[PDB]
Amino acid sequence: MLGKVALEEAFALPRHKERTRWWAGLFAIDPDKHAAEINDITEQRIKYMNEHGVGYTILSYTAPGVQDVWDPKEAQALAVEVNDYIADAIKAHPDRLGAFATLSMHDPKEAAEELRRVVTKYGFKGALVNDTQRAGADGDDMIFYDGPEWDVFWSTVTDLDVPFYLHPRNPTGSIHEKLWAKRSWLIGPPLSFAQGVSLHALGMVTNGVFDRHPKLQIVLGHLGEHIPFDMWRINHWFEDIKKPLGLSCKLTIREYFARNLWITTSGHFSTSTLQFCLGEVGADRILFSIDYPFENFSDACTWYDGLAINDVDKRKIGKDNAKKLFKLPQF
Amino acid sequence: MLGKVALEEAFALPRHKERTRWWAGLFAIDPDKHAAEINDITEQRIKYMNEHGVGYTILSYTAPGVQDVWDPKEAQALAVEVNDYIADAIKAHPDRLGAFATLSMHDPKEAAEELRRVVTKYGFKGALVNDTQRAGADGDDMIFYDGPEWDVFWSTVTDLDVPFYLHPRNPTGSIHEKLWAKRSWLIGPPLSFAQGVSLHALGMVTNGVFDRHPKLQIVLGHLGEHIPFDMWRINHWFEDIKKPLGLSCKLTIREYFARNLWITTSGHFSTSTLQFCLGEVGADRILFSIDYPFENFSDACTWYDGLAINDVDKRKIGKDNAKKLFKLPQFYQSED
Amino acid sequence: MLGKVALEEAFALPRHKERTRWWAGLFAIDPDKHAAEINDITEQRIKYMNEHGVGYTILSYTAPGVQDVWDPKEAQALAVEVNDYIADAIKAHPDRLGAFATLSMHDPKEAAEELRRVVTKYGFKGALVNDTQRAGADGDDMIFYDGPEWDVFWSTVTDLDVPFYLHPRNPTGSIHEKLWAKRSWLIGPPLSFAQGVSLHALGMVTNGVFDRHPKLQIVLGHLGEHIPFDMWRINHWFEDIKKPLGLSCKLTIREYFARNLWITTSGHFSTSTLQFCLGEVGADRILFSIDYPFENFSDACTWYDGLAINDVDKRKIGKDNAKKLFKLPQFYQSED
Amino acid sequence: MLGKVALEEAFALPRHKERTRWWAGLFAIDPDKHAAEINDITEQRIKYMNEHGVGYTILSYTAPGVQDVWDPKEAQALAVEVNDYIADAIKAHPDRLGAFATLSMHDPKEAAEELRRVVTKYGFKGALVNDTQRAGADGDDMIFYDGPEWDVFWSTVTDLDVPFYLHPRNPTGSIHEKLWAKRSWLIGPPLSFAQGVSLHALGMVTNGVFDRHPKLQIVLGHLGEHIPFDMWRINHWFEDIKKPLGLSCKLTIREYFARNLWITTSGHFSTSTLQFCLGEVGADRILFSIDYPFENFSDACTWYDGLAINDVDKRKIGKDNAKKLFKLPQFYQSE
Ligand SMILES: [Zn+2]
Numbered sequence A: 001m002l003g004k005v006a007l008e009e010a011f012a013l014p015r016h017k018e019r020t021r022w023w024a025g026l027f028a029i030d031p032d033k034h035a036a037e038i039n040d041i042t043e044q045r046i047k048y049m050n051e052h053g054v055g056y057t058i059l060s061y062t063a064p065g066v067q068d069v070w071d072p073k074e075a076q077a078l079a080v081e082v083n084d085y086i087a088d089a090i091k092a093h094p095d096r097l098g099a100f101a102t103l104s105m106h107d108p109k110e111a112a113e114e115l116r117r118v119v120t121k122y123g124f125k126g127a128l129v130n131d132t133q134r135a136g137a138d139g140d141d142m143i144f145y146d147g148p149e150w151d152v153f154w155s156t157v158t159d160l161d162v163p164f165y166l167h168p169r170n171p172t173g174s175i176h177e178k179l180w181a182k183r184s185w186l187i188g189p190p191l192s193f194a195q196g197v198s199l200h201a202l203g204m205v206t207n208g209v210f211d212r213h214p215k216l217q218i219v220l221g222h223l224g225e226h227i228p229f230d231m232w233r234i235n236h237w238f239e240d241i242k243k244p245l246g247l248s249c250k251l252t253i254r255e256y257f258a259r260n261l262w263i264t265t266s267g268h269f270s271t272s273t274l275q276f277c278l279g280e281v282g283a284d285r286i287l288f289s290i291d292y293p294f295e296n297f298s299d300a301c302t303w304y305d306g307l308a309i310n311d312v313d314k315r316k317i318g319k320d321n322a323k324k325l326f327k328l329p330q331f
Numbered sequence B, C: 001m002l003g004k005v006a007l008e009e010a011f012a013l014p015r016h017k018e019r020t021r022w023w024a025g026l027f028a029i030d031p032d033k034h035a036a037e038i039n040d041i042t043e044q045r046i047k048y049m050n051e052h053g054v055g056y057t058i059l060s061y062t063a064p065g066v067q068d069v070w071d072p073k074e075a076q077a078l079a080v081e082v083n084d085y086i087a088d089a090i091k092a093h094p095d096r097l098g099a100f101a102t103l104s105m106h107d108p109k110e111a112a113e114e115l116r117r118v119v120t121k122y123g124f125k126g127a128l129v130n131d132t133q134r135a136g137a138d139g140d141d142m143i144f145y146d147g148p149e150w151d152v153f154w155s156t157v158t159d160l161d162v163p164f165y166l167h168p169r170n171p172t173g174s175i176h177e178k179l180w181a182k183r184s185w186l187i188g189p190p191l192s193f194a195q196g197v198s199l200h201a202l203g204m205v206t207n208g209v210f211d212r213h214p215k216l217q218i219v220l221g222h223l224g225e226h227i228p229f230d231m232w233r234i235n236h237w238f239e240d241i242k243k244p245l246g247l248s249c250k251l252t253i254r255e256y257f258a259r260n261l262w263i264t265t266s267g268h269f270s271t272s273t274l275q276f277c278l279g280e281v282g283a284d285r286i287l288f289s290i291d292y293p294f295e296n297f298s299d300a301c302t303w304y305d306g307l308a309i310n311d312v313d314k315r316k317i318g319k320d321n322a323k324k325l326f327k328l329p330q331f332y333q334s335e336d
Numbered sequence D: 001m002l003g004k005v006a007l008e009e010a011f012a013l014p015r016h017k018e019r020t021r022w023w024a025g026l027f028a029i030d031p032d033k034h035a036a037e038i039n040d041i042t043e044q045r046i047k048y049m050n051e052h053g054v055g056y057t058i059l060s061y062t063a064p065g066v067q068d069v070w071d072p073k074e075a076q077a078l079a080v081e082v083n084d085y086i087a088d089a090i091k092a093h094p095d096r097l098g099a100f101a102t103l104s105m106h107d108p109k110e111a112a113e114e115l116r117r118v119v120t121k122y123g124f125k126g127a128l129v130n131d132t133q134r135a136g137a138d139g140d141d142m143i144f145y146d147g148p149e150w151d152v153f154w155s156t157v158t159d160l161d162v163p164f165y166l167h168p169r170n171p172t173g174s175i176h177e178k179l180w181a182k183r184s185w186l187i188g189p190p191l192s193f194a195q196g197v198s199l200h201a202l203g204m205v206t207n208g209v210f211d212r213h214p215k216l217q218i219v220l221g222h223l224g225e226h227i228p229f230d231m232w233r234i235n236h237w238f239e240d241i242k243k244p245l246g247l248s249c250k251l252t253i254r255e256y257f258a259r260n261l262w263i264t265t266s267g268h269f270s271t272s273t274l275q276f277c278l279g280e281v282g283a284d285r286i287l288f289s290i291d292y293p294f295e296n297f298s299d300a301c302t303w304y305d306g307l308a309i310n311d312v313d314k315r316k317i318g319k320d321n322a323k324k325l326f327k328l329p330q331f332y333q334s335e
Helices: A017-027 A031-039 A044-051 A072-090 A108-122 A148-160 A173-186 A192-206 A227-245 A253-259 A271-280 A297-305 A311-325 B017-027 B031-039 B044-051 B072-089 B108-122 B148-160 B173-186 B192-206 B227-245 B253-259 B271-280 B297-305 B311-325 C014-027 C031-039 C044-051 C072-090 C108-122 C148-160 C173-186 C192-206 C227-245 C253-259 C271-280 C297-305 C311-325 D017-027 D031-039 D044-051 D072-090 D108-122 D148-160 D173-186 D192-206 D227-245 D253-259 D271-280 D297-305 D311-325
Strands: A004-011 A054-061 A097-099 A127-130 A133-135 A141-143 A164-167 A218-220 A261-264 B004-011 B054-061 B097-099 B127-130 B133-135 B141-143 B164-167 B218-220 B261-264 C004-011 C054-061 C097-099 C127-130 C133-135 C141-143 C164-167 C218-220 C261-264 D004-011 D054-061 D097-099 D127-130 D133-135 D141-143 D164-167 D218-220 D261-264
Touching: A004 A031, A004 A164, A004 A297, A004 A311, A017 A031, A017 B227, A031 A044, A044 A054, A044 A297, A054 A072, A054 A311, A072 A097, A072 A108, A108 A148, A164 A192, A173 B173, A173 B192, A192 A218, A192 A227, A192 B173, A192 B192, A227 A253, A227 A271, A227 B227, A227 B271, A253 A261, A253 C311, A271 B227, A271 B271, A271 C271, A271 D271, A311 C253, B004 B031, B004 B164, B004 B297, B004 B311, B017 B031, B031 B044, B044 B054, B044 B297, B054 B072, B054 B311, B072 B097, B072 B108, B108 B148, B164 B192, B192 B218, B192 B227, B227 B253, B227 B271, B253 B261, B253 D311, B271 C271, B271 D271, B311 D253, C004 C031, C004 C164, C004 C297, C004 C311, C014 C031, C014 D227, C031 C044, C044 C054, C044 C297, C054 C072, C054 C311, C072 C097, C072 C108, C108 C148, C164 C192, C173 D173, C173 D192, C192 C218, C192 C227, C192 D173, C192 D192, C227 C253, C227 C271, C227 D017, C227 D227, C227 D271, C253 C261, C271 D227, C271 D271, D004 D031, D004 D164, D004 D297, D004 D311, D017 D031, D031 D044, D044 D054, D044 D297, D054 D072, D054 D311, D072 D097, D072 D108, D108 D148, D164 D192, D192 D218, D192 D227, D227 D253, D227 D271, D253 D261
Parallel strands: A004 A054, A054 A097, A127 A164, A164 A218, A218 A261, B004 B054, B054 B097, B127 B164, B164 B218, B218 B261, C004 C054, C054 C097, C127 C164, C164 C218, C218 C261, D004 D054, D054 D097, D127 D164, D164 D218, D218 D261
Antiparallel strands: A133 A141, B133 B141, C133 C141, D133 D141
């Protein structure tokens, strides 16, 4: 299928030679090739899109990115730097590349302000944030976005009417030491990433973010970070036990997945898991994505192009869902 | 279907009135009914079994159980008490009831000794442990069982040739405060349980427990605690990325799921998810279970009995897999 | 789910009551109840709808119906009689009952005129025809509708822009002797029904009916009469072998299923098969239906209401798909 | 996966230039290549097996084959010629190739004798028959094998303990004229094949063949010729309606699929449909197969080798089911 849209596509600042090497050392077998591809915006990246039937990709800042910076001023400075950099880096290819906002999430008002700046000034398609914001004097704290103090931020997101992509980040500090350091090969795609995002996303659900912000659209990669596997189980325990006991979210987990949540196929090129999600989530709420350069185009697009499923859903998941959600023009 | 076998089925010590009521208040809408049912061994429990085509159930000690006890001598004493108590309580119904060992997991050799004692003396069918063992001055530490220092225990498990059921437990201490306190309705079946078990189980994989103990059979509840959903993803990242980078487990994740791991249907009465795991895991490695009394017999068994699937897999998952894995003898309605 | 729409729901003429009761005793286990229910339009039928969350049903003449009548003048008269009869029987319940046209299919122009007559005059929602029209001196010939002489009919269908439901009928005559008489328990739902409809439907595909009439909407019951099972196989052989050899239909089988063909859940209350069709066909092209009174409301609606699938597709299949396809009005009343 | 077993793999008699060309003209786009491949036994065929991780294939006579021959004497002669021919053609590769019996099904006793003869003499692994036997003066009759007169044949099948593969055949005669001639592109894999086999197999079910012959193993190609799609529907109507009305088969349709029936992946390389059949039929009763040369090795084996399913079922379907069902000897890479 031609004209596919992908939206979990990363880039790194070229000056961060060491940080890119460190992250590559955890998640890529060819650090040099990885660095070249995660730094490149318009050369190899578009060549890959042209070979593999991708018409448009929305770019986002590499993880852990700004969420790893626990000094508020330093984090804000990096976010502004990244936003200006990518807006300028993509400007010559408005029909092939868009961008998500990079944000410091230390302060709701500041984050809302920066999102508004780059959405209005640059036409950014939304925000992509790498899970909780590292905070505290030594970076051992975590900022979740499901508390009431974030209403001012979510109100800006819905005012702009753009989606928010809740991307994983690596575990750090005391949490890392107590749970992951002794089983470190599980860090990232294998397990740690999904546990972080699903905890955060279900916090937004049960702490009422989608009740206070009904128009809010949150996107999850990797076919929903475990959640669809337990859709029956979560629904059963929410509706039959936890809600009778005090849980006060207004809707069912299935209603939130029909109105507020999206999942993408990033780094999860599983025909098996996709069919299952056609039932549990539905083709109307599933988006193609790659997770480039951590995943390569050939893996993602060889798989998708070969999918033997009905033409309607292949078109919706491949591009038409994203066209509608991100208000994309002809690209 | 008659003669079904279920094996994530809990009991509590009757003397623990307050602890049982506390746990019941978190996970049951009728705490009084819950307490009565989790205390009962031979009356209502067998009556439910008779009404719902369950021939045999293997009983285990309630969570958090012994893994919540961070004083080693108190933990060992509780484990011995529970094992002696349940062994005596089921003695009249060898054709309907078995038991898993309850263990303090503070010390590998001590756990090995208690397991050998109760398997040999009472004919226990295996061990059921509620995730990590709380330890340290205030119980803020966690003992995982995937390090080599646990070899003496795992070698005892395979010597006895019985499975080990890795059950969840609630998050506690600093982990609870940092991650769960502000989103507490996710504690338990909704999310926290599976995250604990999957972390521990995949730690056993990547830290080589199944390479050092290739005969070891580990059972996971709730259709595998998320893992099958990511089977493709885990396999891809292990084989194509992590192993090139240094991960040295001998087999693929799919091979471990064919040789060492099992999943049960406990608390996951999802036709959708079961059909999915027929592909990712396979009917040979799936066991029926209920999670009684946190779940009720009617929900689990009306669902299972109504499954419109092939007769071979239905019989295997319903009872025949367990009959072989737990070397069960003829039990009530086991034949047909 | 309330307000469901079902559209493979049969009725018979009261004057055939004795004949209806006799046949029901051969193919239904409670023939008296079956006969009473297939004859009833507004009492028990509406009662069942209210008790099982069905807001609207489109009625059709029971099979074999007019397609069993091989005399053209008798067949046309029966079609006219049935249409006038049902229009009058439902007139008091415009928010609960609609109807499909009953047609004699001996002559394309005659069928087109009767379809136009009842769609315009009575607001019928489409046509339901029971597979081929019996013809010939002894009724042993079969009229298929995929030949060029039927273009005049299909152009009227698209002019009116209403769907055509291709319903099965029993095998008759020499075909019945040669293939079915000695294995007669396969007649009907078990096998013969689907084999007839799939032959006719794929004949329309391969003979270009949907190329000449790109707006034509054909509805198939019973989750598509086998076809989705072989979607991969049919596509492979059409695209890679048959088309190179001469097959000249313009689109792929998947394109026709996205643009022209629909399936309903009539008499196929299979979560397994539905889940499979979510992939092969897609929730946008699947419609809930019952096959009453051959199936009962409780079987169909207990199954559908209990489906543990995503809310979007559940609403589409349950009622929203039909609302759009059949141009159903707002229902400013809810009796469920 | 190495050491796969495939068992719906066709060959033709080289002397049959016109019949082979005719059949290929309906079902193959490269007539020259097709003719060369369906005639070759040990050259290109084994090379394909070596390329695609197939250790063993059980060969069978092309459709419609002997079931198209309505003269009993001619039919029997063709069956014997084919059987002797293939046994001799494969004798040099006992580690790569086996064969199914080709039979004339005009007479139960005669078919029984020929099956025993070649199973005993040549070590054939079973029988493969292309649906009903054409009969009658002009070949317009069809012999189904679900009548009581076939008990003597099925008893020999169970005496030998070899499976029976029920393969499709093209529609002919008045049935062809009335139903298929005006929509002829549906003939074969598209539709006509499954309709024939499914009618015949479900005839065996409802007419009690598996009740009189409980050890009988029948194999169906193409993931079961539609039947698994309607398993729920067939079961519902059999158990809740037809049996109360008079259907007298002893077991449910699901029980017959657990005890007597098998399906293969021949010409149905659909991950979707296979996953569905893991539920409706079960990996213990599914066999890998290709339908060569109508299908090519690369299509079937690239698909199977790439299947992202659990290791137990992949090896069972890929080879271990067939190794036990057909009592296969050690073959190339079978371990
Ligand atoms: Zn074949």
